[PDB]
Design a protein around this nucleic acid. Structure first.
Lengths: 96, 137, 178, 168, 221
RNA sequence: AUCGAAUCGCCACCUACAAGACUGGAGCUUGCUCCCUCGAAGGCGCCAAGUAUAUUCAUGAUCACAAGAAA
RNA sequence: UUAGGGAUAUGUGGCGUCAAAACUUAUGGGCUCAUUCUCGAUACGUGAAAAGGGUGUUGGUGGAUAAAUCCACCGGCCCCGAAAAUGGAUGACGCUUAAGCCCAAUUAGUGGUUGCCCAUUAUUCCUUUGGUAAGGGCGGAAACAAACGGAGAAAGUGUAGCCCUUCCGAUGU
RNA sequence: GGCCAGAACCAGCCCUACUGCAUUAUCCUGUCGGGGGUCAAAAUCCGGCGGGCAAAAGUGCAAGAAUUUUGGGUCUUGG
C-alpha cells in the first residue's frame, strides 16, 4: 500500500459521477489523544480546550467506479489506526 | 485592480445563502454585497429571523440558492471595508437597524412565496440518506 | 446491445501489370469489427481463392453497407467453420433478429457457444432474410404465430444504479446502507 | 403481483436505460429477449429495439397487429385512450412526481418540509381528538388505572388527599 | 452480572442515560450463504456492527445429500497427532456462518479479529433482538433472485441437523413460539394502525389548503 | 471521582408472517376484460406544537473537533 | 530493465470477500448440475489422464415415411472409464438468475468517441551525480558611510564545486 | 514572525465540457404483380415501375483559441 492517499467510502454516495462532485472538499478525522494539547483558538475560546483532535485533508479524486473517492491528508498520512472509522466530508469549498 | 469580481455569477446580491461554516451553521442568510477587491461577501439576515448579524463570508464557505429577493430597495453602499477594522458598538449596532429594518420590507414585497421569512428561519442539516450531491439548489 | 460486427463491402483487384492489365475487380462481403479486419479477410479470400496477394493487390473501397429499418425478421445464415476434429463442417441456421449484422453477429456467438469456434475459423457463406413459411425449425417457427403472448416469469429486477442499496429494510424500500 | 404478458401491444414502461421512466407500446416480438417499442405521442420513443429485461409490462393493451405502420398505432393509442388511462394511475402519479423531486430547488424542499409537518401536526390533533375511544399505551392504561378509585376514593385517601393539597 | 461492578458504578456515577450502539440486524431467511457472508464481510471491514439472525434458514445451492457430504469431507480433516489442536468443526448454523464469514476476513490481524468480533449470529430471533427496530435484508444475497427456482437447494438448518447440531428441534419450537406472540400482538395493533392511517386522510381535509397542493406535488397526497 | 473523548436518527404506526411460476377483489375467453383502496412509499424528525401577523441571537470579529449533548 | 522523490497514464494480470478495481457492470448471446481424492475455473506446468462408452442435455449433416415421426453419422458441455498410503487444498472461503465455460461490450439500436484497479515501466515536474558533455559571464558599467536593498564574481579536471543556462545517461557478480 | 491555517490573483502544467468535413442505394418511400397467411386483412418475402434526404447513422477523418469579463486540479510546480 502507498500510504499517501487514503480511500473513503462516504455514505449514500454510490456512483462515480457522484464522487466528482466532492473533488476538493475538506475531510477530517476526529480522533482523540490522552492529555489535552494545544488547540487552534486556544485561550481565545478556552471552551474548546479538550482531548479531542483532528487531522485534515482534501478529496483528490474518485477512486474506483462507485462512490469511492481518494483523499490527501495534508503533509502527512492518517494513522493506520483510523482504518474502518469515521471520516468527515464537509460541504466546503462550495463550487455552487 | 481597483474593484472587480471573479466571484461566480451564480452568487449575486440578493441570493439566499446557506452558511456552511462558522458560528452560524446551516442558518440560511441573505447575500448582500461583495467587498471592493475580491472580498468576503457581506451576508445579512435581519438577525431577527436567524440571529445572523452582518458578517463577512467568503464565496467558498457558502452555497448560493436559486431563490433571490429584490434588494434594490436596500442601500448597500453604507457597508464598506472600514466598518470591520478594530479586530455591541453603536457604529455597528444601528447599522443593523438601517439594513434589517430596510431588508425586512424588501422581503415583504415579494410574491409567490411572499414569505421567505419562514424559509429564512430554519437550519440546513444533512440528515441520514440525503446525498446533497444529487440536489439542485 | 448493437451487434459487434459491422457489415462491409470490400472491392479490390490485383495491381495492373504488363502480364494482366485490367484485372477483374472482385467484390466481397464481410462481417468484421474494423475495416482492417474486413480488409484483411478480403486479402485472405483473394490469395486463397484467386491467388492474388495483398502486396500485389489494390483495394478500391472498404465502405460499410447500412442495415434496413428494424423489423422482426427470420434470417438464414449458412456458416462453415474449422475444427481439426471434423475438418470443416458446414451449417445452415435461422435466427430471429432485426438486421443482417444483428443476425450474423448472433451466429458468431452461437458457434462460439455451442461449437466453440472463434471468428477466425468461421466464414459466413451467405445471409438473407427469408419469408415466414420457409422457417424449418420449430424453435424459430413459433415466433411468427400471431397472437403470440407470454408473461415475464422469474425475473431479476436491478434497481437504478443510483439506488442499489446494499441493506434494504425488510418488506420496505427504505435503504439502511446504500 | 399481476404478471400481464408480452403481446403485440402492451403499454409498457422502460426500467433503466437512457429512456427510463418513459412509457412505450410493444409492437413486434424479436425472439425471446428482444421487442420493438414505439410511443408516437412521445417523440424520442421512436421505433427501436428494446430488451425485455428492461421492460415492465403494465395493465393496458392497445389492439394492433404485429409490425404496425405507426399511423395505425397512433390512431389505436387515441381510440384506446390508454395513455390517458395510465395518466391517472397511482404509480404514474409518482413517476411523474419523482421527476419533480430531483428538480427541487431547496426552497421547494422547504415547501414540502412545511407541508409534511402540517399533515403531521393535524394528524396528531385529529388522532388525539379521539378521547372517546382510547387505545394508546399512555391513554389506555390510564383507562386501566381507572376504576381503581376503590382503594382511592374510600376513607384512606379521603383524609390523606385533604392533608396533602392543604400543604400545597 | 456481565458488566464489572465499576462500569456499573461508573455509569451510575456519571449518570447520563443507557446506551446502545447503532447496530444492523439482518434476518437471513433464504439468503444465499456465500453471497450473504461476503456482503457482511465487507461491511465488517468498514466498521459496522452487525447482528445476523435466523442462520438456520440460510440456503446453499444443490441437493441436501450433496451439501451434507461437503460438510462431512470437512469433518474428515483433523490434526492426526493431537486432534484437540486439530481443525475444529462447528455444527450449529450460526457457527457455520461466522466461519464462512471469518475465512473471508484477514482474521490473523488485529483488524481481522476486530471485524469478526463485531458480528453476532443467532438461531431464530432471540428476545435480545426481537423488538429493536426493523430487520434488514440483503437483496443481492436473496434466493428468489440468485437461484433459478428450477434448481434444488438446501436449508442450512436442515443440513446441519444430520451432523451434530442437535438443537434443531429446540429452535423450531422457539420460532413457532415467537411468531405467534408477534402475530397476536400484530393483529392486536390493527385497531391502532387503522386509526392513524385514517387520521392522515382526515387531517388532509382541515389542513391549510395551500400546503396540500404541495403534498399533491412531490406526491404524498 | 479521576473523566477532558472519538460516535452525531428518533419512534408504545418499522420493530409479525409468507410468497417471487407471485399476495388487492373477480369473470371465462386462460390472456384479456372489469371492479377497488388502482397494486412503486413504515411513520416521524430537518428550528413558532405549526404555516401565520410573531419573537432574544452580533464582538465567538472570513475556515478550524459542533465552543453544542435527552428529539 | 532499476539515481532520490511527486503527479498523471499504462503493461502482464485482474474487478464476490481475503484484496486495490463492476458497493456481485450492461438496459449482452448461448451452454453446464457433477453423492465422500467432494463438476469446473492462470498459459509455460503429465505441476495429470487415454482407448472406449452414455434414450444426460444442446447443436449440426445425410437419407426416409407422412401428425408429425424414424434411421445413420458428426460436434459442445457434462457423466462413466478414474485405485495409495499424516488432514488438506481452483491459493482459502465459497460460487450454480456463476463468483463456471465459449464469445462479446463499456454505462448501451440513444445519438461514438478512453468503465475501473495495480508496476523501480511510459510521459512530465523537482532534486542528485557523471559526461566524448553544449553554451554564456569573468577589462569589476556608473551610484551608493555609519546613526535614526544585502552579498559574491577564482581563465577554472578534482573542493564548501568560479558563476549561470541547457541536454543526455544513472541498476550489476 | 523563518510557525500553523484559509481565501483571492499570475505563469506553466494536467484534466474535463463544448463539433465540423465527407459518406450512405444490398437503403427510403410510393405503387402494381405475385406470395403468404387469417374469420377477414395487414406484415415478414421475391419481382416490375415511379420518386428520393431514413436526416439521421454506434460510417471515415476532425484542427472546435476553456477569463477571448467566467469549467475544474496543483498540500504534484513556482510566484
Amino acid at each position: 500500500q502507498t500510504k499517501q492517499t487514503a480511500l473513503v467510502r462516504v455514505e449514500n454516495v454510490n456512483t462515480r459521477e457522484d464522487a466528482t462532485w466532492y473533488v476538493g472538499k475538506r475531510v477530517c478525522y476526529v480522533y482523540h489523544g490522552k492529555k489535552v494539547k494545544r488547540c487552534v483558538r486556544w485561550s481565545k475560546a478556552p471552551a474548546r480546550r479538550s482531548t479531542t483532535r483532528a487531522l485534515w485533508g482534501r478529496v483528490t479524486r474518485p477512486h474506483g467506479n462507485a462512490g469511492m473517492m481518494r483523499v490527501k491528508f495534508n503533509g502527512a498520512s492518517v494513522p493506520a489506526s483510523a482504518i474502518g472509522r469515521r471520516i468527515r466530508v464537509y460541504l466546503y469549498p462550495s463550487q455552487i | 485592480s481597483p474593484e472587480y469580481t471573479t466571484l461566480r455569477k451564480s452568487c449575486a446580491p440578493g441570493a439566499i445563502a446557506i452558511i456552511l461554516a462558522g458560528r452560524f451553521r446551516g442558518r440560511r442568510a441573505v447575500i448582500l454585497k461583495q467587498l471592493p477587491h475580491n472580498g468576503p461577501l457581506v451576508v445579512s439576515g435581519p438577525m431577527k429571523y436567524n440571529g445572523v448579524p452582518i458578517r463577512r463570508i467568503d464565496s467558498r464557505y457558502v452555497i448560493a440558492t436559486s431563490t433571490t429577493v429584490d434588494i434594490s430597495s436596500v442601500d448597500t453602499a453604507s457597508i464598506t471595508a472600514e466598518v470591520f477594522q478594530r479586530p455591541v458598538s453603536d457604529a455597528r449596532a444601528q447599522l443593523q437597524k438601517k439594513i434589517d429594518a430596510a431588508l425586512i420590507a424588501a422581503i415583504k414585497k415579494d410574491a409567490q412565496g411572499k414569505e421567505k421569512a419562514g424559509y429564512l428561519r430554519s437550519v440546513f442539516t444533512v440528515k441520514p440518506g440525503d446525498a446533497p450531491h444529487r440536489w439542485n439548489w | 446491445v448493437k451487434p459487434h460486427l459491422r457489415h462491409y463491402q470490400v472491392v479490390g483487384r490485383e495491381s495492373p501489370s504488363e502480364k494482366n492489365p485490367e484485372p477483374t475487380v472482385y467484390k466481397f462481403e464481410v462481417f468484421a469489427p474494423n475495416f482492417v479486419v474486413a480488409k484483411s479477410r478480403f486479402w485472405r479470400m483473394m490469395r486463397v481463392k484467386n491467388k492474388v496477394k495483398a502486396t500485389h493487390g489494390d483495394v478500391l473501397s472498404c465502405k460499410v453497407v447500412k442495415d434496413a429499418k428494424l423489423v422482426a425478421r427470420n434470417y438464414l445464415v449458412d456458416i462453415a467453420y474449422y475444427s481439426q476434429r471434423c475438418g470443416y463442417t458446414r451449417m445452415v441456421k435461422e435466427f430471429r433478429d432485426v438486421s443482417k449484422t444483428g443476425a450474423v453477429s448472433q451466429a458468431y456467438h452461437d458457434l462460439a457457444s455451442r461449437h466453440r469456434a472463434r471468428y477466425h475459423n468461421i466464414e459466413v457463406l451467405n445471409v438473407k432474410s427469408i419469408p415466414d413459411h420457409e422457417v424449418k425449425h420449430l424453435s424459430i417457427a413459433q415466433y411468427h404465430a400471431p397472437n403470440l403472448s407470454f408473461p415475464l416469469l422469474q425475473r431479476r429486477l436491478k434497481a437504478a444504479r443510483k439506488d442499489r442499496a446494499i441493506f434494504v429494510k425488510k418488506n420496505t424500500k427504505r435503504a439502511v446502507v446504500a | 403481483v399481476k404478471s400481464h404478458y408480452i403481446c403485440a401491444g402492451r403499454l409498457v414502461r422502460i426500467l433503466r436505460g437512457p429512456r427510463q421512466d418513459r412509457v412505450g407500446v410493444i409492437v413486434d416480438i424479436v425472439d425471446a429477449n428482444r421487442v420493438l417499442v414505439e410511443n408516437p405521442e412521445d417523440a424520442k420513443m421512436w421505433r427501436h429495439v428494446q430488451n425485455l429485461k428492461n421492460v415492465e409490462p403494465l395493465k393496458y393493451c392497445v389492439s394492433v397487429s404485429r409490425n404496425c405502420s405507426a399511423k395505425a398505432l397512433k390512431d389505436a393509442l387515441a381510440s384506446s385512450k390508454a395513455l390517458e388511462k395510465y395518466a391517472k394511475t397511482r404509480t404514474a402519479a409518482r413517476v411523474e412526481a419523482k421527476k419533480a423531486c430531483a428538480a427541487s430547488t431547496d426552497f421547494e424542499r422547504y415547501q414540502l418540509r412545511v407541508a409534511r409537518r402540517s399533515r403531521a401536526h393535524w394528524a396528531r390533533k385529529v388522532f388525539d381528538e379521539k378521547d372517546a375511544k382510547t387505545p394508546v399505551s399512555w391513554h389506555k392504561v390510564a383507562l386501566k388505572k381507572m376504576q381503581k378509585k376503590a382503594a382511592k376514593m374510600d376513607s384512606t385517601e379521603g383524609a390523606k388527599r385533604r392533608m396533602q393539597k392543604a400543604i400545597a | 452480572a456481565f458488566p464489572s461492578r465499576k462500569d456499573a458504578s461508573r455509569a451510575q456515577r456519571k449518570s447520563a442515560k443507557k446506551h446502545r450502539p447503532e447496530i444492523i440486524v439482518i434476518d437471513l431467511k433464504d439468503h444465499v450463504l456465500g453471497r450473504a457472508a461476503a456482503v457482511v464481510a465487507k461491511q465488517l471491514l468498514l466498521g459496522k456492527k452487525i447482528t445476523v439472525v435466523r442462520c438456520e434458514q440460510l440456503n446453499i445451492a444443490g441437493t441436501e445429500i450433496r451439501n451434507k457430504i461437503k460438510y462431512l469431507q470437512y469433518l474428515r480433516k483433523r490434526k492426526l497427532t493431537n486432534p484437540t489442536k486439530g481443525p475444529f468443526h462447528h455444527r450449529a448454523p450460526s457457527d457455520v456462518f461466522v466461519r464462512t464469514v471469518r475465512s473471508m476476513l484477514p482474521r490473523y490481524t488485529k483488524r481481522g479479529m476486530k471485524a469478526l468480533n463485531s458480528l453476532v449470529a443467532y438461531e431464530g430471533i432471540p428476545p435480545n433482538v426481537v423488538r429493536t427496530g426493523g430487520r434488514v435484508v440483503i437483496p443481492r444475497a436473496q434466493r428468489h433472485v440468485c437461484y433459478r427456482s428450477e434448481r434444488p437447494y438446501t436449508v442450512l438448518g436442515n443440513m446441519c441437523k444430520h451432523v451434530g447440531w442437535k438443537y434443531s428441534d429446540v429452535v423450531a419450537n422457539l420460532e413457532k413460539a415467537r411468531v405467534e406472540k408477534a402475530s397476536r400482538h400484530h393483529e392486536k395493533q390493527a385497531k391502532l394502525r387503522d386509526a392513524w392511517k385514517s387520521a392522515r386522510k382526515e387531517a388532509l381535509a382541515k389542513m391549510p389548503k395551500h400546503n396540500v397542493e404541495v403534498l399533491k406535488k412531490f406526491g404524498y397526497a
